[PDB]
Symmetry: D2
Subunit: 461 residues, 4 copies
């Protein structure tokens, strides 16, 4: 028997497999790569450490990497994001996976360690697929010898890419990386439209609250903030937006949102006097989207309207000051990943107290913690990029290069625009969309190939 896994319930595997078969039909770009490359086995010999939300969508990614010849050892990059039926289906296929919904922090770290170690010794990994950079950091700090044999890292998300660029600037990055996030078929698909789909989904599953007619404050208006604001406005919320970037704030104004600060004149002096108590006393829902720290701070939480919902769809659990809430206020679990936080004091609560907030997913990614994250047809884009990135770095064989050649290739790069366009075309055909083919006269006129690429690398879409 296969035993090299740890999942909540292996008996969920048949359900997981039914959902994987549906997901394949929703992921034409990823299934296109399976069909194109299966014969050629471009990841034969690849041994991939994977750390990304163990969802049905990640299951189709894993089985694509395996279909192209890879071996993998997998964990989730978040304690609440695993779909237990997806983890079970992957374990039942004989793939090492260590993931369940509702891990402790200690279990989270143990699951990553179970991917790194096989039978008590470092696995002979030669590739990394990461979401958020925790596995990347553990390899660099705790297993630096393993990075001598690793050809590359493919990084999913905005925050993970920031961490790679910090290592590259400091000369501590040991292997090259592909920034998957900044493909247009990732950043301007997943980060925006994924949150559009999944933020209102997660709030409805957690609370079943009406959103129409209520007041929201979205902190941030990057790709996640844009999609989150639309998720709420399209339901009929009155959405206000906070930003530190005046260009993003300009976009929020033109998109029909009022731009406000939680702080008087936008200045946080650290005192309660700097809080716009009148603004926050009218807010029914706060959503953090920044990838920054303490953007929904203790003084903001004290000033929020009674019975406001608080949630985070960006970075870790520290966009909201959940540590302040754990120390000072009394938590009542409604159901998993839904807590009433009683502002009456730190110990006991009255079941009928009216002065509480509702926190979703303990301040962790709400779309994955309270629903199922982005849908298959959106993750198709992200995960087709991940597969292309794995193929590219594995074929370059960085770990085998002489030192002089390594020095030239030690970088954090995006995939070429031609590949971003090829992913997009498969996504468009999935919708039954028909792209026009330029005439040679038209291609000459605008200075492009009929085949593309269609835009210069400066183009922002």
């Amino acid at each position: 028997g296969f035993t090299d896994y740890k999942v909540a319930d292996i008996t969920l595997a048949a359900w997981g497999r039914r959902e994987l078969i549906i997901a394949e039909s929703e992921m034409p770009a990823l299934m296109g790569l399976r069909r194109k490359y299966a014969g050629q086995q471009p990841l034969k010999g690849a041994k991939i450490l994977g750390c990304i939300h163990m969802t049905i969508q990640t299951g189709v990614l894993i089985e694509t990497l395996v279909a192209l010849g890879a071996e993998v050892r997998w964990s989730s990059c978040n304690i609440f994001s695993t779909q237990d039926q997806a983890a079970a289906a992957i374990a039942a296929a004989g793939i090492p996976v260590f993931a369940w919904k509702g891990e402790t922090e200690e279990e989270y770290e143990w699951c990553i360690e179970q991917t790194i170690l096989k039978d008590g010794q470092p696995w002979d990994a030669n590739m990394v697929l990461d979401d958020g950079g925790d596995l990347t950091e553990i390899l660099h700090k705790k297993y630096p010898q393993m990075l001598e044999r690793i050809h590359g890292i493919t990084e999913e998300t905005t925050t993970g890419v920031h961490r790679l660029l910090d290592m590259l600037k400091n000369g501590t990055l040991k292997v090259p990386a592909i920034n998957v996030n900044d493909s247009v078929t990732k950043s301007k698909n997943d980060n925006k439209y994924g949150c559009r789909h999944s933020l209102n989904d997660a709030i409805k599953r957690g609370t079943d609250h009406l959103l129409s007619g209520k007041q929201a404050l979205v902190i941030g208006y990057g790709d996640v903030g844009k999609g989150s604001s639309q998720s709420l406005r399209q339901e009929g919320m009155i959405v206000k937006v906070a930003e530190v970037d005046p260009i993003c704030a300009m976009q929020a104004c033109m998109d029909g949102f009022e731009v406000v600060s939680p702080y008087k004149n936008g200045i946080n002096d650290g005192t309660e006097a700097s809080i716009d108590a009148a603004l926050l006393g009218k807010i029914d829902l706060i959503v953090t989207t920044t990838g920054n720290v303490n953007v929904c701070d203790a003084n903001m939480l004290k000033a929020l309207k009674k019975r406001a919902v608080v949630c985070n769809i960006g970075a870790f659990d520290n966009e909201i000051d959940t540590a302040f809430m754990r120390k000072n206020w009394a938590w009542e679990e409604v159901k998993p990943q839904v807590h009433k936080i009683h502002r009456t004091g730190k110990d006991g609560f009255d079941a009928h107290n009216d002065d509480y907030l509702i926190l979703l997913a303990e301040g962790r990614l709400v779309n994955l913690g309270n629903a199922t994250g982005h849908p298959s047809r959106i993750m198709d884009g992200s995960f087709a990029n991940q597969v292309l990135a794995q193929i590219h770095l594995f074929e370059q064989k960085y770990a085998d290069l002489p030192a002089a050649e390594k020095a030239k290739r030690l970088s954090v790069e995006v995939l070429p625009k031609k590949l971003d366009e090829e992913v997009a075309l498969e996504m468009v055909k999935g919708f039954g969309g028909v792209v026009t083919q330029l005439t040679p006269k038209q291609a000459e006129y605008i200075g492009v190939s009929v085949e593309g690429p269609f835009k210069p690398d400066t183009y922002r879409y």
Copy 2:
């Protein structure tokens, strides 16, 4: 007195001045530059040849350049885009302007020549401000000795920038340029939200048609196609989108549009048989947004539903095959810039014929031809960038540089992100928006200065 101008009717000046005084109140970024720089006169000695739509918005731009010390000589860059009251108010302020709504092509060329020549001889021009590149082209082909003493070109629009980059690639560009278009406070403000405002405006003014419930086809989904599609969808049109760029097409799908081609399978076979007659036979409105040639071709025009409206909001009138319609079909003027084009033949029409198309602005930019183009508060972004670009190139004094130093500076560049952010901030304050200030701990965490810039140059917004 002052006679160095040609406008439709100088008696419109008082009306134009009333509208300029309103427009100043809608343009805080541009009036902020007036207030900041008036004392230091950074354009003292600047002699600007201007060629851009002679609107009220352009009037505030002209008067800002003059307030900062510049002398100008102005023309419109389109035969239909002048607002006669704007042209009159500028002439009445003693500024040379040669512009009226409804120029012939011969008059258009004569107006540009009247900016270039003062009293029959080259003007001592030392700067160019252009929209679409026609003035730039005339100087390069016909007045090369004038370009010897010109420090730079500031170019407004996507098509004009493409023409500059073609000259730079061929080594024929004689002076450096700033690509004003690709400021985020231009491309992702004017090109998108301006067309959102002004496309449905122009269609209503020209036709007074109900848009709700009718079928539109928007050709292109770049910045202008995105804003145009929203202009129509927000009115309740059923909008279909055509694209050659699969990434733009993916955006159109995720934005909730069906992506279609006028050609079967997207392929033009050179014949009528390749036209999707069933699709085009249901379309009430076609809008071209591409900057490309013949994207609404003769065979598409033959297949359109009876009484369909045809218009173009890209920079030039060759997106639609209007030459085909001039040669083959009978034009009936409804009113200025609105023609019924009778598909019954060239030599006369029945006044009650049902088989016609309605063409707006004879296929020229419809927002400016049938309405007033973008609103002041949007043009504020574009024109604040134009003023900063004029200051930057004028201060660099390229014409005065020795040959070896010119070679290092001969480029087509965008303004630095810090300036794009400073324009955006004044636009946000104009809406009463309040940007948040990062704390020192937050700025250190995300790796930015508290003052900005907030994003790397790769960021796409």
Copy 3:
């Protein structure tokens, strides 16, 4: 050889006729009635006094009544709503019309009198078609003997119907009326979707203001307030709604609007202290939609943000306290139907004053005053109802009935639902819509005829 008219400029007739031929193609319900009834001449001997906005749409209505055998004498029901090309085309067809854009109030009354009198004596009128009730009131108060020969009144608008119902309650109504307004193909087409089309249109034509990102207050959330709110929100305005009717307020909340009052706690105590100065100080645009009096009162006008736009789209100009502004503040005409109202005093203003409001159409219906009112394809529904109402009351011949039979028929009634459905079907076919036919089994199951009507008279749609 026709002089029985007064219009601004008869030379506009050819332009008017071109626009009437376009409008016929946009009005299938009205042109369906022309085709169906032309043979029967059901209005042969009808002599209709008409008083409704002299637009292109009203032109097609007039020519339908004439095609079915009627003679008419026509005036506009508003001093600013005439389209001079429409009035000219009607005069040029030999129809008596007394209407021009920009009448004085004295000219307005003179125009209605020229319809009532032919060659200095009362016309032998036998039908009335009214919008707002002014002609109805003049006949009752000043020409009661003419009402002895009149078979009925067909009334277009909410306020005119209210005036009829007041006469009927008081026993002063002399002839029966049809309430055209309350057909679903009028009230829930024209009043709502017409204002959706034409409010943003009129504001853009008058001011060319950007609406996106700015704050609006819509007073009222009936059919006009619902359409007006959507006109603004779809442009990206942040819309707040005021209401006195809690059911309409509930709809505004669920539609995604914040419901506010100009008055603290919704109580107007007549003092400045009762004004919510903080709310009105943030408003860029106020729109009145109520059909009520003084809903934008002197204290609200004093408190509005500098440079706010003020307009009314309800039937009469006393929704806004324009009398207060005429007595106290200095009016600056920007252009026709656009005034800056300087809150600095009565007897002069600084041309560069910042403390003004912008009033559109001097507080009269803004959609008709600053644009062209509702589009042809919407007015098709209203005007097909008007024609059916004229045919129905003319055929009943009330004036010829004995007193006992008159008493049974003296009422204000709506058209039967079957006729409302027949108008709707022609409107749907105009969009290329395909209505499904019930099977006999389905019709039996839901208890309707396959031909309709499909809904009980209580149904609200």
Copy 4:
């Protein structure tokens, strides 16, 4: 030792009670009635048979009836609509409830019988609260002696009201009813906005499909069809609408939808040749909203695009021909209330077959079957009307009237507009909305009391 109940799992009671305490804070109109009437106990002696979806919202309704003095015996009106935690919390409070999610049809009927009988014998019921009419029908057919002592029926839904009106027409209705559905704070709140909230919710929970960019067909455009169409369009679906009522079809056109029929020219001739195969071959999602029979028929199911989702949000499961699919096609359960229906035959299926449909909730109400139905703050309106209707009929004491007095009161009536307005006001205050108070002069001008009602009974909102 209370045992007079049957629920899935009594240990879910604590979770249900936490959700009821949250729901109370979202239901101000219902909690307002508790506060107002608790002292007076207007339902003291009331013995209510309730048959409505056993949700958290129904829990707050039940506990309001009990707080006002009623005893109840409860069942669900649908096999899949119970929330097991709500049923457990009501059982744990000592209230007889017979309800669980996933009843068989035999269990459904047994649950209704357990409300009717206490200890084997008719309960001393004197009131009925019904949703859909099944309990009403069972009492009329099987328990006529019980209806002798019943004062009235309060009926929730459109289909149930139709069944009452059919009994009233036939003289078979034994007790008077209130049509709760046709309160504006029910029909134009619940039926529309509830489905707006809950349709996309249920589709996401069942399938996790992306909706953006996909094609939907909504059958019907009444209140449910309007809310359903918005649920999908706001997610970015391309929505087409089918209707038999041309007035509802006109609304769909003006709302920006294409109106289509499954049948060529809208004629179902019963043959496959009448199916618009090209239309149905492009549809990803069909939603039935009609309250009619066989509106998504066998020939339509055969023609649908592979892997289309099929669901019903009308009251009963015969809108879709699920009988045809049970007889002809192989059902694969994905998870509860989600089936793949393999069009390859009845016998088995290939696990990787591509030719299937996805049916949600076995064709039963999808919002309640696959999600939690409408949110608390919407059901507040419906259920405040239910409580007022119960109070009204209970106070009238119809069963105690002599035969001659019964004959005068045997009707199906709506609540008076004043009560509809009082429910709306509490709903508006729940959003923080501020209704304006008319001045005496304004109230006199529009002919209403300052307290309301504000509209005539003919008003359609």
